[PDB]
Design a protein around this nucleic acid. Structure first.
Ligand code: AZT
Ligand code: CA
Lengths: 554, 412
DNA sequence: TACCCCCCCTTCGGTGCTTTGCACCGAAGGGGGGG
């Protein structure tokens, strides 16, 4: 054979052998387009006829190239992949257009037959053995071993990406001012060269890629804006996503909502303020992907205003490494947040959204910190720096939160933006007991078998209560006992519990909860003017903690 | 041209496969430049995706350094070489190091580049440099010499090191020298001026053996333990005695002599929290005897070299931080408190980073080990910012805890 | 009826402390997107 470029050694998982599985009953319609290009491979040295000395077999099929009449070949290696050695992918992420610095001229060129231009490893080739079908079952069909990277293997992408870099390395060193965004075979090349010199250098690189036997087809090649790159339309000074089609179905299934949600998550990167909360509330705990489910009046409202954002076209800008990065966040309610990252006011680099609900009980400050960290990670990926933050929280609101919180927390350089709704702490536990406020010693208990329990309290002024509780747990009664003391107390109240569980939940100042009992405690705490929570150990003969421990066990 | 010591992983164990986390621009620049010159000097050489192993890499500046320093996160590799640097080629610990009035840390990590590495082990040192916005896929490398920050590196070089030291260990007999990875700890009872001179002598004594030193000054005798303390009040409220009894109740798991009966008696009624309670004779006495037991040492606490060290840290607010180092629960080998660290009253993460570094340094001097940390922080908060404030050439093991202060045990 | 990468949103099951309840998290299958 012949030898284009430096190969990569491959192995199997030690003490294991190759792929012996029988072919799929493929329809003769695909077989026509199949054996056509298949026989053309052997001429170029891409595939080879093998003797039965090769005892391996792997299935094969083909799917049409999207937006093309051409067909693309795929070999099912699922069983070969299970027994093939592990790699470490060199694809660490995806480039974003909002990271592109502005370039005077830009060229985008695909590599024709990308995997097939890279030589496989000599000794490993035997394991690619597969057989080609026929119109009848009489003729057997030739068995072949790949001499290059097959579409469908688990090592094909990683080896291609790494080989491509070694090829582009000498050129990149000769042309330091050329920006080559290398993603698989898709190449974005840009420069500040004048368009005449730029295309000249493009040809040197097409020659340099050709010197290693890498094709640069003209049809894939694009010389004029707006470039189609990574599903975007790149214009000289602006960019946008390629248009987004929302399904028009009258009756929705589960696979319909999924397609809708994903399309919206994709749109949320530039179209500001996309919300997925109420559409995703429909997919919780559903069995069938095919099941039909109705649209709530909430999710119907959400899809309408999400279509109105998509109605008017939007666009992003490019990165100016000289000017600062700015990220401003707004609160959308129900644990939903959106953000815009920009440099010049009102010209966005990109947008996004953080709606993750982390934990059973949370508040708006916790969720804002989680969103700031999501943006910081996202921003260090794309621009390698942390943006300056414009946050809808008062400076003294934050200063109070992080100083008092028992866990370490922080936010980078930021300034207050007065855009409502503002983030606030809806209540504040006193650091010291309240003089003149009634003091409530609460307690609760449940029977592990009966699921029946009591929750009540005693006070210094003689007040009392006990409540029977049905199908409850020791935790719920300890929370319930506090709910009572909040209901039956004045605007200022001291509450003494022996529950570690409840005091932990309340001291973190939540404004939202999955538990409905907690929301009612939250609701009461906002109403109060001064609340003081305290803790004593149980069964120590302490205070009224012993007296109410007696009432609720009876 | 030196003989390569063979290294094998722990029995039945695979090399480190750890993803590379995003890096800032200034750190990627510093790394590419550090990695370029290290390649033309043959210390490293590029590799390919056939290598299934990877280790994260980033850059730091030491305290006041101003010059970038490369740092690799070998915690996953070190956990899988554990047989090597403990059982086989390990170092004895000089228990007298903690007793010296001054100790200086020097970065000798540049000498590990002298010795080559076992060829079969270079497959586990793979690390990847990321690219801003994924302009380029990951550029991979691996180490041809002893890597800076691997725990097998100081053990292999130990033979070469003790020879380089021997003339100066003889020229100055009573000066203590300990080596923990990329750092060399040297301590004397000499005065500050005499001490810093013998360091420069040790620097030149290292120069003629082919090593530079891009010094940290400790004072192990100075460090002070933190004890559990009871408040002083001329009048006690119900909440005061309730808080007090809860604290003593918690402290009874360490000092068993703690008694609560006469103070619990004072609470017997159902009273308002702010109401004043005069102390009885036996309560005043039970309080007195309790204050004395907390002066004592914990009975039966001692260090076990076979066991791992644990380090808990609690944020006390207004710049204060507390910490306790233990092996078994409630058997505390040391307790302490830090205050007015860098970043106080403005940045929590920086202080917490500064605290981990100080605590780890103390454990290295005292026991020659790095403890596993229980950190009061959320995982996402810490994993984001911690590299920005890290100034040390080692990286301890840590986990994250959420333990609200039901009782303020370690600080009033 | 293939492979590799990134993202969100949901379930589920393992883990440890708040304890045999509840809360957290990470793996995984749904989708979108790139080649
Ligand atoms: C779209 C697609 C691409 N790939 C890989 C394999 C392909 N390499 N090859 N041969 C690369 C690039 O595919 P592609 O760039 O889309 O087209 P290609 O096969 O390289 O031939 P061309 O039309 O003349 O340009 O991505 C895949 O494995 N499965 C897919 O569905
Ligand atoms: Ca192609």
């Amino acid at each position: 054979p012949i030898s284009p470029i430096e190969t990569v050694p491959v192995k199997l998982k030690p003490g294991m052998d190759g792929p012996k599985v029988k072919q799929w009953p493929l329809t003769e319609e695909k077989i026509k387009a199949l054996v056509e290009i298949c026989t053309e491979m052997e001429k170029e040295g891409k595939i080879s006829k093998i003797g039965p000395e090769n005892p391996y077999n792997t299935p094969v099929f083909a799917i049409k190239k999207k937006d093309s009449t051409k067909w693309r070949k795929l070999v099912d290696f699922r069983e070969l992949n299970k027994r093939t050695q592990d790699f470490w992918e060199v694809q660490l992420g995806i480039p974003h257009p909002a990271g592109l610095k502005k370039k005077k001229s830009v060229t985008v060129l695909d590599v024709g037959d990308a995997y097939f231009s890279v030589p496989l490893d000599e000794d490993f080739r035997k394991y690619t053995a597969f057989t080609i079908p026929s119109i009848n079952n009489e003729t057997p069909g030739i068995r072949y071993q790949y001499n290059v990277l097959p579409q469908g293997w688990k090592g094909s992408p990683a080896i291609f990406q790494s080989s491509m870099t070694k090829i582009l390395e000498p050129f990149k060193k000769q042309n330091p001012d050329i920006v080559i965004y290398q993603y698989m075979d898709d190449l974005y090349v840009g420069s500040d060269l004048e368009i005449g010199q730029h295309r000249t250098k493009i040809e040197e690189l097409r020659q340099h890629l050709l010197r290693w036997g890498l094709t640069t087809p003209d049809k894939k090649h694009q010389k004029e804006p707006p470039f189609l790159w990574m599903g975007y339309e790149l214009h000289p000074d602006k960019w946008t996503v390629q248009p987004i089609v929302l399904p028009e179905k009258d009756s929705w299934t589960v696979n319909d909502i999924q397609k809708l949600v994903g399309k919206l998550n994709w749109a949320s990167q530039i179209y500001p303020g996309i919300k997925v909360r109420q559409l995703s509330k429909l997919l919780r705990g559903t069995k069938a992907l095919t099941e039909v489910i109705p649209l709530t009046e909430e999710a119907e409202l959400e899809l309408a205003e999400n279509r109105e954002i998509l109605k008017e076209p939007v666009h992003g800008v490019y990165y100016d490494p000289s000017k600062d990065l700015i990220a401003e966040i707004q609160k959308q309610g129900q644990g939903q947040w959106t953000y815009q990252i920009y440099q010049e006011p009102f010209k966005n680099l990109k947008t996004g959204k953080y709606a993750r609900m982390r934990g059973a009980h949370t508040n708006d400050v916790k969720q804002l910190t989680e969103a700031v960290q999501k943006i910081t990670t996202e921003s260090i990926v794309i621009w390698g720096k942390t943006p300056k933050f414009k946050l809808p929280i008062q400076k003294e609101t934050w200063e109070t939160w992080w100083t008092e919180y028992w866990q370490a927390t922080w936010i980078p350089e930021w300034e207050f933006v007065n855009t409502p709704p503002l983030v606030k702490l809806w209540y504040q536990l006193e650091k010291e007991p309240i003089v003149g406020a009634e003091t409530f010693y609460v307690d609760g208990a449940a029977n592990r078998e009966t699921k029946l329990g009591k929750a009540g309290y005693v006070t210094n002024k003689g007040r009392q209560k006990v409540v029977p509780l049905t199908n409850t747990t020791n935790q719920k009664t300890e929370l319930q006992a506090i709910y009572l003391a909040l209901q039956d107390s004045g605007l200022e109240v001291n509450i003494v519990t022996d529950s570690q569980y409840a005091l932990g939940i309340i001291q973190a100042q939540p404004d939202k909860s999955e538990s409905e009992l907690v929301n009612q405690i939250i609701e009461q705490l906002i109403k109060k003017e001064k609340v003081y929570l305290a803790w004593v150990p149980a069964h120590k003969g302490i205070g009224g903690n012993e007296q109410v421990d007696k009432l609720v066990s009876a | 041209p030196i003989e390569t010591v063979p290294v094998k992983l722990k029995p039945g164990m695979d090399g480190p496969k750890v993803k590379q986390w995003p890096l800032t621009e200034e750190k990627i620049k510093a790394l590419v430049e550090i990695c370029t010159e290290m390649e033309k000097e043959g210390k490293i050489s590029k590799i390919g995706p056939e290598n299934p192993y990877n280790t994260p890499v980033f850059a730091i500046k030491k305290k006041d350094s101003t010059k970038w320093r490369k740092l690799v996160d070998f915690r996953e590799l070190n956990k899988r070489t554990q047989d090597f640097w403990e059982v086989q080629l390990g170092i004895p610990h000089p228990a007298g190091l903690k007793k010296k009035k001054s100790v200086t840390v020097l970065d000798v990590g540049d000498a590990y580049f002298s010795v080559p590495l076992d060829e079969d082990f270079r497959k586990y040192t793979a690390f990847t440099i990321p690219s801003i916005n994924n302009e380029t896929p990951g550029i991979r490398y691996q180490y041809n010499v002893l890597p800076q920050g691997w725990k097998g590196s100081p053990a292999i070089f130990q033979s070469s090191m003790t020879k380089i030291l021997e003339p100066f260990k003889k020229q100055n007999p009573d000066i203590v020298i300990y080596q923990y990875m990329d750092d060399l700890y040297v301590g004397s009872d000499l005065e500050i001026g005499q001490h810093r001179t013998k360091i420069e002598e040790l620097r030149q004594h290292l120069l003629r053996w082919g090593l530079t030193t891009p010094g940290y000054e400790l004072h192990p005798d100075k460090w002070t333990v933190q004890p559990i303390v009871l408040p002083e009040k001329d009048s006690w409220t119900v909440n005061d005695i309730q808080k007090l009894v809860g604290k003593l109740n918690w402290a009874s798991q360490i000092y068993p002599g703690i008694k609560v009966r006469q103070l619990s008696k004072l609470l017997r009624g159902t009273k308002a929290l702010t109401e004043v309670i005069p102390l009885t004779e036996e309560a005043e006495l039970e309080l007195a005897e309790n204050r004395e037991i907390l002066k004592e040492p914990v009975h039966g606490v001692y260090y076990d070299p076979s066991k791992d060290l644990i380090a808990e840290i609690q944020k006390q607010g207004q710049g204060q931080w507390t910490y306790q180092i233990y092996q078994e629960p409630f058997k505390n080998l040391k307790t302490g408190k830090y205050a007015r660290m860098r970043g106080a009253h403005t940045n929590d993460v920086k202080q917490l980073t500064e605290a981990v570094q100080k605590i780890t340094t103390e454990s290295i001097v005292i026991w020659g080990k790095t403890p596993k940390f229980k950190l009061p922080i959320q995982k996402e908060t810490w994993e984001t910012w911690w590299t920005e404030y890290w100034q040390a050439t080692w990286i301890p093991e840590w986990e994250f805890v959420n333990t609200p202060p039901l009782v303020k045990l370690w600080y009033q």
